């Protein structure tokens, strides 16, 4: 699992469950091409998005649909989505965990990158 | 000043000075059109982006060039940029501060919306 995404809820102190997200990869013409998508599980984690063969060098974007998550909880959030953009595998393959911690008007994102 | 941006540095404990950013407004065809841009001041703030007349309801994206900021300090960053995508809503007189707190492998953003 070279790319995993973990989402937490800072209001409830819990994993953020059923959070949809889309992953895009920048193509040679500099447009965003669909790469993978999914939703977080009961643990707030989304596994199995890609494989080591498919996950080549490039610039990737993870668009986390935080708006839908908050609205289903009756909260009108500030952000449309949390957007994480990064170069992957520039120095050879890595494993990437993209984490997001969500509040209605704020979010943080970090990456844990291992060899 | 209906819209202001402030950027802090979590490694140095200081405003993030000379950080470039562009603001985009979502167009009818889902494209991002340039709206405003600038560089943060010695206080890490960017003022005068727009006016109340021009800053109408809609979806806006602030794209913060965090990669160049870290490169200039000699620090290897994870993100290509920090993106903040939000809907501007007319519900009372509102002034928006978009803030970002930067680390090489992590960032946080929040909105301080006041009257
Ligand atoms: C931005 C997301 C985030 O905010 C934080 C605030 C305080 C401490 C950690 C975090 C954190 C994490 O990244 C994170 C949390 C867990 I639990 C975890 O298992 C993994 I891997 C990553
Ligand atoms: C993500 C932005 C952010 O990260 C933080 C981490 C800890 C405490 C506060 C913050 C903070 C702020 O909102 C913020 C900070 C300052 I100083 C400020 O002048 C204004 I307006 C806003």
Curated annotation (Swiss-Prot), chains A, B:
Result of changing residue 55 to L: In AMYLD1; amyloid polyneuropathy
Residues bearing carbohydrate: 89
Phenotype for residue 43 to P: In AMYLD1; amyloid polyneuropathy
Subcellular location: Secreted; Cytoplasm
GO cellular component, one term: protein-containing complex
Effect of residue 82 to S: In AMYLD1; amyloid polyneuropathy
Entry superkingdom: Eukaryota
Biological process according to GO: negative regulation of glomerular filtration; phototransduction, visible light; purine nucleobase metabolic process; retinoid metabolic process
Modified residues (4-carboxyglutamate): 33
Consequence the record notes for mutating residue 1 to R: In AMYLD1; amyloid polyneuropathy
Effect of residue 36 to D: In AMYLD1; amyloid cardiomyopathy
Effect of residue 46 to P: In AMYLD1; amyloid polyneuropathy
Phenotype upon changing residue 26 to N: In AMYLD1; amyloid polyneuropathy
UniProt record similarity statement: Belongs to the transthyretin family.
Assembly: Homotetramer. Dimer of dimers. In the homotetramer, subunits assemble around a central channel that can accommodate two ligand molecules. Interacts with RBP4.
This protein's name: Transthyretin
Record organism: Homo sapiens (Human)
């Amino acid at each position: 699992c070279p790319l995993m995404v973990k989402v937490l809820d800072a209001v409830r102190g819990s994993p953020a469950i059923n959070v949809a997200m889309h992953v895009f990869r920048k193509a040679a013409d500099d447009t965003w091409e669909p790469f993978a998508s999914g939703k977080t599980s009961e643990s707030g984690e989304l596994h199995g998005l890609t494989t080591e063969e498919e996950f080549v060098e490039g610039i990737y974007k993870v668009e986390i649909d935080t708006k839908s998550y908050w609205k289903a909880l009756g909260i009108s959030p500030f952000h449309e989505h949390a957007e994480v953009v990064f170069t992957a595998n520039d120095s050879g393959p890595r494993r990437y965990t993209i984490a997001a911690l969500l509040s209605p008007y704020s979010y943080s994102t970090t990456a844990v990158v291992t060899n």
